[PDB]
Design a protein around this ligand. Structure first.
Ligand SMILES: Nc1c(O)cccc1C(=O)O
Ligand SMILES: Nc1c(O)cccc1C(=O)O
Ligand SMILES: [Fe+2]
Ligand SMILES: [Fe+2]
Ligand SMILES: [Fe+2]
Ligand SMILES: [Fe+2]
Lengths: 174, 174
């Protein structure tokens, strides 16, 4: 069977889900229960967490512009996703997507992580660059499981306290 | 490291590889040595073989129109990939892509099959619909390993002979 339905027009689908491609929802997964996790991500959205994905992530910035804050070679770096750009992110490269533009739309493709293969979410100290806090999660339902993880970081000065220099991470906003 | 390079503009990449998005090459893989196998497929091309992929395949028909001949519920079916369509194909649905238009371009995303997970390529009898021939292959390098597989089918009346009704499959062209 065509478990995931027939082909359909993607620009019209994006237009039809505009109300979800902005705060507070931000993103919408295209198909459910599939191995390929296919998501369209809108904006605006900024975030301070870095994702440590044990598998690859594919990006195609269909509308508008965004960028990824990265750690590369032990250094803070930025990869621009200009409108029309595609990009393949290797496993475990720490990344923090920033999406300043309303009306933007990025196709993201990931694969389901098998049982035992954990994702990491972590925060870094703006003063000295040391890792402040990391949580590992079996990421089955990100839409609903990530918000409480992030909220528990924002809520705890202990979690936000840099172990190296003592500076308390600002939490939700840079 | 950014093992697969920086982001880059996809429409310009497609324009720059136009000479490969037509016979005899037909398609071009975007990144090498990655888990996500990302390919742009042009045209024109018609084929008689059906692919049995043990994993999912994602399609986004960026330019022009194409279609997939399928077997669904034990019946010959067609899924149109009109310009702008996206589509997620479930594992093992037999499919035979047909790409009649020059200048067409389809983004296809697959994942590397691990050792021991085999692909199938097979042909069906136009007279009675019975399976005529199947080859299983550890698909590490399709660009170079599929042509000899297909050629060995076209070259052998035995391989092309329907076991049910005796009709000899036409081979390369329907
Ligand atoms: N990369 C993302 C993902 O995998 C899910 C939702 C959003 C994003 C993003 O790039 O913002
Ligand atoms: N689906 C395809 C693939 O995986 C590789 C090359 C071509 C195609 C196609 O759809 O024609
Ligand atoms: Fe990610
Ligand atoms: Fe610090
Ligand atoms: Fe295929
Ligand atoms: Fe037959």
């Amino acid at each position: 069977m065509l478990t995931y339905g027939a082909p359909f027009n993607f620009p019209r689908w994006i237009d039809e889900h505009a109300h979800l491609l902005k705060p507070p929802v931000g993103n919408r997964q295209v198909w459910q229960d599939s191995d390929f996790i296919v998501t369209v991500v809108g904006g605006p959205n900024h975030r301070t967490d870095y994702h440590d994905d044990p598998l690859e992530e594919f990006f195609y910035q269909l509308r508008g512009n965004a960028y990824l804050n990265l750690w590369v070679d032990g250094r803070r770096e930025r990869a621009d996703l200009k409108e029309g750009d595609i990009f393949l992110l290797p496993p475990h490269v720490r990344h923090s997507p920033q999406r300043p533009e309303a009306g933007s739309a990025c196709l993201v493709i990931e694969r389901q992580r098998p049982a035992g293969m954990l994702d990491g979410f972590e925060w870094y100290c703006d003063a000295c660059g040391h890792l402040v806090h990391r949580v590992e999660v079996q990421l089955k339902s990100p839409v609903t499981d990530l918000p409480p993880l992030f909220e528990s970081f924002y809520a705890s000065e202990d979690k936000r306290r840099c172990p190296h220099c003592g500076q308390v991470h600002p939490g939700r906003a840079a």
